């Protein structure tokens, strides 16, 4: 497998959810932002996987799951069995990063994606080593009542530039917002 990355997007008051979707209005090129960067894969004959708590498999919408052309995995503690179209569930985060170590999944997995929620984002950013939290920065506040960690930029380095990734603002629906990528190595 290859590494181990973070994607979120956030508001200006630090939101990622509210009542199990997201805050703002559906913003359609950064949705494809999302799709696009855990979808592509940089190894041929492999696919990426997206690491997922619960409420965030819910807040995907049916008719989108198990998210097209990417492994999915839920996270659930108390889950008797795997959520209808998840192809794989796991108890913790170490298991189910353990699970692409396997060697028939390691060789069909390129990099490991999480895609929250909260508790996962945490996590995974502080587990040392070599870690990539990619951020869309919505240029507004949004009610919300989910939130991601303000970034330790002591740890987290702000790249000036990332390949495939547009640095200009964005605008839709009158929103703005920026790609970012951060990077630590500890
Ligand atoms: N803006 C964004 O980028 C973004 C990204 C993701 C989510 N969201 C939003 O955030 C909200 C969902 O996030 P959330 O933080 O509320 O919930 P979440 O982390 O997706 O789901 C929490 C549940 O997942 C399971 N879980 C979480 N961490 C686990 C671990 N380490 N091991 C095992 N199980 C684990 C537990 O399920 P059990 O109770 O079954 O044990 C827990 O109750 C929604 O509003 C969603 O739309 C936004
Ligand atoms: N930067 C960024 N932005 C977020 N919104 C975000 N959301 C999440 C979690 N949630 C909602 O909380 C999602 C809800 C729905 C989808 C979804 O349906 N995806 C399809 C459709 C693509 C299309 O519309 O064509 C796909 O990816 O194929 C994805 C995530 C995680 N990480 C994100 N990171």
New binding site residues.
Partial sequence: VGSLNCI???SQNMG???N???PWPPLRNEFRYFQRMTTTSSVEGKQNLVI?????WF?IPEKNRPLKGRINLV?????KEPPQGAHFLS???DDALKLTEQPELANKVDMVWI??????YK?AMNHPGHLKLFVTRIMQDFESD?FFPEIDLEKYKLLPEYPGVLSDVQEEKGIKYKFEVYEKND
């Avoid at 996270?75 to 889950?79: G, K, V, W």
């Avoid at 895609?115 to 996962?120: A, H, L, M």
Wanted: glycine share 16%.
């Fill in positions: 979120v997007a956030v990622i959810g509210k199990g979707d997201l997922m708590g619960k409420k965030t807040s996270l659930s503690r108390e889950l108890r913790s985060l895609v929250g929620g909260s508790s996962v996590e989910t």
